[model samples]
Target: GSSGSSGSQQRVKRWGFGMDEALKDPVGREQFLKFLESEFSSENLRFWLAVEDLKKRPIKEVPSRVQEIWQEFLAPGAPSAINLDSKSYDKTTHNVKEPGRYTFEDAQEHIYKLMKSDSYPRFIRSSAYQELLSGPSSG
Candidate 1:
């Protein structure tokens, strides 16, 4: 039968970690380490992708299988798999919507692809990415 077990929860336990609520205790910390050992973690691009993905869906939809995958990507130092430096990486990897970061032509191409893509989900922010891609970079 389909139990209500969270996907992230299962992944956590499979790797031997208690939940975040349990992280307050000593045993939970071990679980946390084990969690890290069992998962392939990264920063930068992963979390950047995750934040964008989460912005598209409700928190409820975030799968357990992807939780650790998602956690490894959070800011304050989203560790890139390929060592993209965070301290020096700002408004460079993406179009920052500033005046000169991306030329109008560059922005235009960005918008065109977004609107034309089929992979976008049901979020205003995601649609806004498309919308912005279709228009000027005032955002």
Candidate 2:
């Protein structure tokens, strides 16, 4: 839904389909990075966030950066054996033993997280919303 150029009026609609449809699915941080790099064009966005391998950062930093969320949302402070592990998740729920628990919320949170994370790269953090709004040009 982003606009095209400044000083002009033409409608340019951008949405996904087919292979681009996969862009709508839950993807890893790496894929998020790729999309951020390619699709974002704003100068005002900042910081992406989502579940990542907590071990990737210093444990102390993880809490502020992303650790508390993992604990609160995924672990709920339960014993490791009963709930999600401490590494990372798309935050999707369900298991091979319990498939019915899964929902679109997983993918929804995922896409939103990529653009709403406090840790995402500037452009990546805000591009999704930007992509949704009318761009510089409009009819």
- TM for every model, in the order presented, reads 0.20, 0.22
Runs off by more than 4 Å, candidate 1: 1-42, 62-70, 75-139
What are the per-residue Cα lDDT tens digits for candidate 1 across 10-60?
Answer: 333322221332234333334333323334431222333344344355445
Error of 2 at 134 (Å): 8.8
Q: Measured by TM-score, how close is model 1 to the native structure? A: 0.20
In Å, residue 131's CA in model 1 sits off its true spot by: 30
Over the stretch 1-139, how does candidate 2's per-residue lDDT look in tens digits?
3543452111112222122322333332333345544544111011112233332556565445443433343444622211322222433433212222122234334444444442244433455424434453455
Relative to the unseen true structure, what is the C-alpha lDDT of residue 51 in candidate 1, on a scale of 0 to 100?
Answer: 40
Residue 69 displacement (Å), model 1: 6.0
List the RMSD of every prediction in angstroms.
19.8, 13.4
lDDT of the candidates, in the order given: 0.32, 0.34
Error of 1 at 93 (Å): 23
- Judge candidate 1 at residue 66 and give its lDDT: 37
Instruction: State the lDDT at 78 in candidate 2.
Output: 27
